[PDB]
Amino acid sequence: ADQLTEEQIAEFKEAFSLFDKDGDGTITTKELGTVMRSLGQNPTEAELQDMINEVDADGNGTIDFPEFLTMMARKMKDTDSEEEIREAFRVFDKDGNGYISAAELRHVMTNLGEKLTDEEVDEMIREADIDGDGQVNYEELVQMMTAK
Ligand SMILES: [Ca+2]
Ligand SMILES: [Ca+2]
Ligand SMILES: [Ca+2]
Ligand SMILES: [Ca+2]
């Protein structure tokens, strides 16, 4: 279970409120738009819509806190600095095959006394294997520990 440090999230809450003047927790097209090029030049509404929708995966017309934080996730997949976190991969990947596999996870669940089926494991595999390449590497593992 890994994420950006709480220290950074706390400081970014202040950066979020820079755009959200009302504090509703969602930045509207106009609340962010004020800080965008509308302050200087005369951009077309279509330009504002483009900038908003490109990060608003939901298409609500509002930038939520994690949508704002998506910009950091573009720069680094994990946005974390601890190399010891990478070890959690090989702790779970007992067979050392370089990827996570259903059989690998089935045994860990069995060790914990959980009786999951192959389809139950797939619920986590689809979260990781977004590109459908058939292999779950560390960057894909991070996807299971974070939002969709
Ligand atoms: Ca707002
Ligand atoms: Ca949204
Ligand atoms: Ca494996
Ligand atoms: Ca993959």
From Swiss-Prot:
Instruction: Tell me if Acetylation is a UniProt keyword of this record.
Output: yes
Q: How is its activity regulated?
A: (Microbial infection) Inactivated by S.flexneri OspC1 and OspC3 proteins, which specifically bind the apo-form of calmodulin, thereby preventing calcium-binding and activity.
Q: Which residues carry this modification: Phosphothreonine?
A: 44, 110
Give all N6-methyllysine modified positions.
Answer: 115
Entry's Gene Ontology cellular component terms = calcium channel complex; calyx of Held; catalytic complex; centrosome; cytoplasm; cytosol; extracellular region; myelin sheath
Protein's UniProt keywords contain Calcium: yes
Sequence positions bearing N6-acetyllysine = 21, 94
- Tell me the segments the record calls region Necessary and sufficient for interaction with PCP4: 76-148
Q: Name one GO biological process term.
A: G protein-coupled receptor signaling pathway
Print the keywords alphabetically. Acetylation, Calcium, Cell projection, Cilium, Cytoplasm, Cytoskeleton, Disease variant, Flagellum, Host-virus interaction, Isopeptide bond, Long QT syndrome, Metal-binding, Methylation, Phosphoprotein, Repeat, Ubl conjugation
Instruction: Name the positions where Ca(2+) 3 binds.
Output: 93, 95, 97, 99, 104
Signal sequence annotation = none
Phosphotyrosine modification sites are 99, 138
Q: Where in the cell is it found?
A: Cytoplasm, Cytoskeleton, Spindle; Cytoplasm, Cytoskeleton, Spindle pole; Cytoplasm, Cytoskeleton, Microtubule organizing center, Centrosome; Cell projection, Cilium, Flagellum
- Show the cross-link location (Glycyl lysine isopeptide (Lys-Gly) (interchain with G-Cter in SUMO2)): 21
Cross-link Glycyl lysine isopeptide (Lys-Gly) (interchain with G-Cter in ubiquitin) per UniProt, renumbered positions:
21
Residues that coordinate or bind Ca(2+) 4: 129, 131, 133, 135, 140
Provide the record's note on post-translational modification. Answer: Ubiquitination results in a strongly decreased activity.
Q: Which residues carry the post-translational modification N6,N6,N6-trimethyllysine, per the record?
A: 115
Q: What family is it from?
A: Belongs to the calmodulin family.
What is this protein's function per UniProt? Calmodulin acts as part of a calcium signal transduction pathway by mediating the control of a large number of enzymes, ion channels, aquaporins and other proteins through calcium-binding. Calcium-binding is required for the activation of calmodulin. Among the enzymes to be stimulated by the calmodulin-calcium complex are a number of protein kinases, such as myosin light-chain kinases and calmodulin-dependent protein kinase type II (CaMK2), and phosphatases.
Disease tied to this protein? Ventricular tachycardia, catecholaminergic polymorphic, 4: An arrhythmogenic disorder characterized by stress-induced, bidirectional ventricular tachycardia that may degenerate into cardiac arrest and cause sudden death. Patients present with recurrent syncope, seizures, or sudden death after physical activity or emotional stress. CPVT4 inheritance is autosomal dominant.
**Domain remark text:** The N-terminal and C-terminal lobes of CALM bind to the C-terminus of KCNQ1 in a clamp-like conformation. Binding of CALM C-terminus to KCNQ1 is calcium-independent but is essential for assembly of the structure. Binding of CALM N-terminus to KCNQ1 is calcium-dependent and regulates electrophysiological activity of the channel. The C-lobe interacts with KCNN4 channels in a calcium-independent manner, whereas the N-lobe interacts with the S4-S5 linker of KCNN4 in a calcium-dependent manner playing a role as calcium sensor and gating the channel.
What is this protein's record name? Calmodulin-1
Organism listed in the record: Homo sapiens (Human)
Question: What gene makes this protein?
Answer: CALM1
